[PDB]
């Protein structure tokens, strides 16, 4: 219930069940599930979108419990993992959108404050990803490589 740059203390989260195996009611087999994952990834969706879709329209509670592996690992093994981790991509999209909004109208200071907060988040996450070497160690983000990446 801690927040990164706010005074909130929210408790909103996902509450994964105790069971480590497939539910007694699941009839589909894991191979069909992973094929579905790969076809959706080919469609061009992020792993979070894959998880939400497979939770809603199908009986996949979570892809790990039935396929034995995590969605990002599935895409990576079949070579569909994006060069940028998806959450960091969403951060960059938010940051470039805020940059554009600040460019259009200048006096708005609250967007500037939220922009510097976003830049802090991006710096932290990118530093972590560099540490795990997901990104190349040269990877650095200042102004315009953002507009290159988001497009």
Partner 1 sequence: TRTSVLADALNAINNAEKTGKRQVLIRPSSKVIIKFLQVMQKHGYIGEFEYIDDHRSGKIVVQLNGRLNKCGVISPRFNVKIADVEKWTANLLPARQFGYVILTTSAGIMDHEEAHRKHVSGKILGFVY
Partner 2 sequence: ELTVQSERAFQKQPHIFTNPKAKANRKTKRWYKNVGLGFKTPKTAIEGSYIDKKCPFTGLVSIRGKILTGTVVSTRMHRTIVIRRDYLHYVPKYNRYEKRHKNVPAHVSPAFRVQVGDIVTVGQCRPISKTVRFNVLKVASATGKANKQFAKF
Partner 3 sequence: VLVQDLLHPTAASEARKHKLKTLVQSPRSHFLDVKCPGCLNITTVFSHAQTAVTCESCSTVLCTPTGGKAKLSEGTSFRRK
Dihedral pair phi/psi, residue 82, rounded to 5°: -65, 150
Q: Which of residues 1-40 bind partner 1 (CB under 8 A)?
A: 2, 18, 20
Distance between CA atoms of residues 78 and 11, nearest Å = 35
Under 8 Å between Cβ of 146 and 92: yes
Q: Which of 20, 27, 39, 107 binds RNA (CB under 7 A)?
A: 107
Distance between CA atoms of residues 71 and 64, nearest Å = 7
Query: Which of 2/79 has CB closer to partner 1?
Result: 2
Q: Which of residues 29-48 bind partner 3 (CB under 8 A)?
A: none
Q: Does the protein bind RNA through residue 10 (CB under 7 A)?
A: yes
Contacts with RNA, residue ranges (CB under 7 A): 1-2, 7-12, 106-107
């Amino acid at each position: 219930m801690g927040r990164m740059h706010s005074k909130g203390k929210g408790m909103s989260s996902s509450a994964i069940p105790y069971s480590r195996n497939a539910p007694a009611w699941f009839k589909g087999s894991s191979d069909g599930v992973v094929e579905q994952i790969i076809k959706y990834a080919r469609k061009g969706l992020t792993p979070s979108q894959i998880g939400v879709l497979l939770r809603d329209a199908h009986g996949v509670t979570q892809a790990k419990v039935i396929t034995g592996n995590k969605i990002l690992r599935i895409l990576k093994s079949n070579g569909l993992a994006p060069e940028i981790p998806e959450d960091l991509y969403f951060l960059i999209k938010k940051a470039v959108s805020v940059r554009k909004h600040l460019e259009r109208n200048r006096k708005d200071k609250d967007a500037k404050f939220r922009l510097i907060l976003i830049e802090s988040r991006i710096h932290r996450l990118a530093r972590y990803y560099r540490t795990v070497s997901v990104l190349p160690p040269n990877w650095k983000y200042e102004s315009a490589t953002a507009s290159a990446l988001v497009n």
